[PDB]
Amino acid sequence: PSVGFASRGSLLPGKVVEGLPVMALNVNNVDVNFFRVKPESLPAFISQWEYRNSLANWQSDKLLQMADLVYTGRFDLNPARTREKLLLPLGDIKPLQQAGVYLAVMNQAGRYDYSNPATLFTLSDIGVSAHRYHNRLDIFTQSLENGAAQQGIEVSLLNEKGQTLTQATSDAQGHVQLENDKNAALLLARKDGQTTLLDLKLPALDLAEFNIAGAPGYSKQFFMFGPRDLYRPGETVILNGLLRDADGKALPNQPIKLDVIKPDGQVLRSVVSQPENGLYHFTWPLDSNAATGMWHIRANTGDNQYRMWDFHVEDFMPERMALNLTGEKTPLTPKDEVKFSVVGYYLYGAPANGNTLQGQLFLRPLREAVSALPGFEFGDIAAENLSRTLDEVQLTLDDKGRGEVSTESQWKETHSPLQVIFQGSLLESGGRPVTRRAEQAIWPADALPGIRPQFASKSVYDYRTDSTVKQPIVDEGSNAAFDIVYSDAQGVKKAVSGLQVRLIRERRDQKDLIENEQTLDLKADETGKVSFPVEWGAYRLEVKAPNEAVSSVRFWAGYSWQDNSDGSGAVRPDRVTLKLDKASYRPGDTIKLHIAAPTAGKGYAMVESSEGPLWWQEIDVRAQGLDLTIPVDKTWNRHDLYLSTLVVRPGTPKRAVGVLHLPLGDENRRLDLALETPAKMRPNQPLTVKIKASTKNGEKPKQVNVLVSAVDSGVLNITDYVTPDPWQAFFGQKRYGADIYDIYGQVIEGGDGDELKRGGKPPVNHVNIVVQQALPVTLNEQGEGSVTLPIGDFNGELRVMAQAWTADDFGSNESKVIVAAPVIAELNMPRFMASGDTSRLTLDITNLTDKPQKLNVALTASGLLELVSDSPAAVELAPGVRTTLFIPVRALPGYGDGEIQATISGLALPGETVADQHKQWKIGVRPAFPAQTVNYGTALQPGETWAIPADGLQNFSPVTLEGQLLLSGKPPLNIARYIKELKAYPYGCLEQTASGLFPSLYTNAAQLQALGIKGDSDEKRRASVDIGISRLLQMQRDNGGFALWDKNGDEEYWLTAYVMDFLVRAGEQGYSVPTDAINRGNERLLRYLQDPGMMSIPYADNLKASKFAVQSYAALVLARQQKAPLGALREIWEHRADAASGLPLLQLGVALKTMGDATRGEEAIALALKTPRIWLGDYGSSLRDNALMLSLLEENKLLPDEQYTLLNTLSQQAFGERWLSTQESNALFLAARTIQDLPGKWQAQTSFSAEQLTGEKAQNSNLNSDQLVTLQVSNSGDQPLWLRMDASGYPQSAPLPANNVLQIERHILGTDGKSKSLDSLRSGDLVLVWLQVKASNSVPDALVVDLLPAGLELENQNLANGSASLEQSGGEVQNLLNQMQQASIKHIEFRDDRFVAAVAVDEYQPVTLVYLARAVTPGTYQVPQPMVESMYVPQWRATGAAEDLLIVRP
């Protein structure tokens, strides 16, 4: 009993019309109404309509207000009881033959439903295909069916408002060139001869199947390069630069502005770089307190289009070993055993003989099985057990440093492609791994079916998994389109017949209901396009190939509440395989292109750039292929040049696109750079690099400049660093500078360092980073030169890198130099040690001589290190043999460094004298517990002095004690942070009305503008107060009391005092309130003081407390008018014990003082500031009451010291409050509106300065323990100064677990999801450390510092290539990972001695954090407690439960 639009397209052709396609079942008569959309403001209609399937009855009023009804036509059909689709004769409708975009709303004759089927369309046989560029836009007009009517004058380009900007004609048969805008919205065709709609708001055609990728530097090229992309905090960043034009040619000496960007996006430093001999060179030191993450240097050549140079800043350890994990290139069959070949070796040139390889084998689905087909999914999504942990790998490499990893197949009957991932960790003799990942593809057949939905993927919430996930969605009652391909691993589409295309409806709340079935035949290099009528709910489209291989994609049918993925539903055109005769072309050459389209079709063939086309027209394509000539022009001096083709053929006219990069990079512009270095060398000796630049036929290397660098391979392998190539930078394939738009897809068919200070001074890491960069040299007449780089005490591999340049000639080369001693003696130690820890250090002595060696190793420990044993080892080593000495050590108490020294004897050298060798290794030591923070804050009056309390810095060790002193002229409470808007609202009930106007009695537009708060004009605000008064007066009852809405309603006792307070204050602020109303109100307030017994508050939990709050408020309002009888006040005072808050007592106190009883008045006020805080009925809270008490004290100019105490308390309460009620923000605004009205100027004389300190804003000053213990500050100003003192450092001993506001707990799980037994921990084990943080109020700036036991090392997730994955190894704690994904995390840091997370937490949302760690150095370790604290409020702090010692076994 339904009828709806089947095509859901935006354009039906004027030729082969057949009207609008409609699918009906048992519906004989259909009433359709057509509406012509108003030409003006048409983009506003499209954005509101969003190309829907149906029209909502309420939302129809707004949408159809910009469209006029032209025809009301009913249509006669003949179905009695099949759901056949049919035509709609539109040719007889004369108003529809006119220009404009139409909307058809159909309904069953006498049916009334919530929504009726609706579609937006245009009747036209015109087919435009626009091309967008950075400045211009070239449109190509055509025609549907047999004919390519190219003439195009009719181009209506409308903006966001809905006004046409330009319209003209050009080129052979017809074409048009127009000015492009950044905020352009539409494009329309023809004045009277039909209309074609094309909008720029829709995503441009997806060219994902085409190689249109490259650098976006179409303008003057600036190649940013350096010796590495990975730095440690405290290192000097080296960056070089060469500026050239679009064709790599030299240009005049111009300055380039460079900015250093932090991971948070803030700039650190800005410089103006000037070139020296055509070379740019930027150097600056990273602070030791620098943030870890992806930093970058951004360059500005002058085009204001930034050039980026990314670099990691991490606590990395250079790799001392190389690990190669190799699978098979070709996918395995489901019957095949999975095998990985392992190769490990020390970079100093020796195999990893006997080294342990620990690892994980995982089974995962291989859905993105063909890289050549991006977006195409392969395999059954409904198939179970495709994600598993296969085995834990534990093996020893042979004498050659070789091994093999294998697992028998446990997926022999799979119909879906799978993958086996080996996450292998090759371990050092100390336990530190070198981790790598290898993947093995498994294919159920040689060719598989692949599915790509043509519809967008939007983020839809799923309450079955309680997590929002982006999934391909389509509107309910609309057809779902899909691209189906039968492809091999390489991407070539194979011919197949008998594909079981099945539309399955998944159970909502029995079994999966098979909705529709199909049979598909595919041709080679053909993309199948299937469309199925979809109803509602969960769906799955599965295609089965005759070889039994099954592939399926899940999709939801329903509503979209915006939240769309950036162009997820973009049109993908059919491919036109374009072939070229030569691999590279030049200005003197002539290109011969073969256009091999799927079928015949007219359109265009051209050469493009980012500034426009260069071969504007070519129109024909005939038979099966077309070889055409393109003469490459001499003025084309750029490498962003591409080729493009378009073909169309009617049956609907199927469109196909072809795109290909035109290579213009000549090989004669490349320098033949040769580097001659020795293959092997000794440490502490200088390395010599012999450079030789040349080129064939020419052989003239005129003034060649060479920049030589040498970096440790163990640094470069972490980020698989590629040697910077200047030829590929300036001449390599640049990105496609165009965007293609066409309508063939819509055609109808039918401070700094402060976080590290809170955690504690990190121990120093003494690792050696071997990096060298010599000055740029000049090569002589022959093109010869030499660079000598001094190499220190390094044992490993060194990568020699060189960059060469002239004006247009660029070269790059690399060579590997092994730096190794005759006998290598290397010590493996943890990253740091804590006080009271024991670590088994390992010393590897390797004989790299051809002769046997006899040595003595003498060991001693200095600093905060001591040897557990004696180790007076006698070492005898045969050629190429390595031994490992176990050196157990203990870390002494305190913060500092430790050292192990080795003096080796009997080193027999050939020819050379036998002399003693010396080696030193340092380790950083720190306490095994987090730092504590002491915080002080006070306002110093002029002349007055502040000194640090004697009991303050007593628990800190002076060595690590650091502090921060912030001085300012304004209080720490910033009202703009809590109040963004302050506007009058004179409507609603009695409470709402008074609450929307109370702040409006005191502020003004000038004050709000100075505060940075949005408000009303003074005129609007005053008019609103007057409206509110007149409304409130109508709620006054005959007894003078006030009701909630009407004068006849029940009396509201607290609100009567509230509204009376408002109305009396309104009078003092220049507003008129009738005298009779005030008198009646005051008479009623007097009844409250005299008669609390007649008060009916039945919902009150504490009736006496409620009655007391009413009387005290009534008392203050009458006393401010000198109308409160002292007898009544004294009798209310006798019941003071009834108060449940300080506010009623402070109000009563002010009343007693005002009316004459200063003794009882001062007693009440003093009692109020000691009394802590429908339910109570007073609409109150602690926050509100503290702000009202503050205004009361200020207003009555009493207890200024108590005012400063409440102001600091308020600042912390506002900070910790999720949302503020109207009365809280009102009270807070009124208490803090006068503090920013004072200047920020301040003066102070301090203990740490001989010169006076002055400023106009808050100026921080870092302090050391000498300064802090004698810290004294004096106010030398005429205004009060505000000081904040934060001191941090390790205590002398470990404190006990404590918590205030915040809560933290730590638990360690194994990768099996079970609790890990902290004794049964072995060197190499991966563990999941789980933190849970809770809070009794909002902590927007919580800093989680989890100091590690020295035996645990973090798996740095930022350096994915060199570490184990949290995602892959955390499958058994997916609940915890999902909880963590929901947390608001500012940043996460994987440091040497700690895990750090900056997070927001509150009472309704506990935070879950999970991190992956590895047990490395064997020993017995102290476990520091987990810590969490607020940066702004350091008193919001928690230390988790004390844990048992951590034992790491060998």
Ligand SMILES: [Cl-]
């Ligand atoms: Cl080991």
Ligand SMILES: [Cl-]
């Ligand atoms: Cl006030």
Ligand SMILES: [Cl-]
């Ligand atoms: Cl802060």
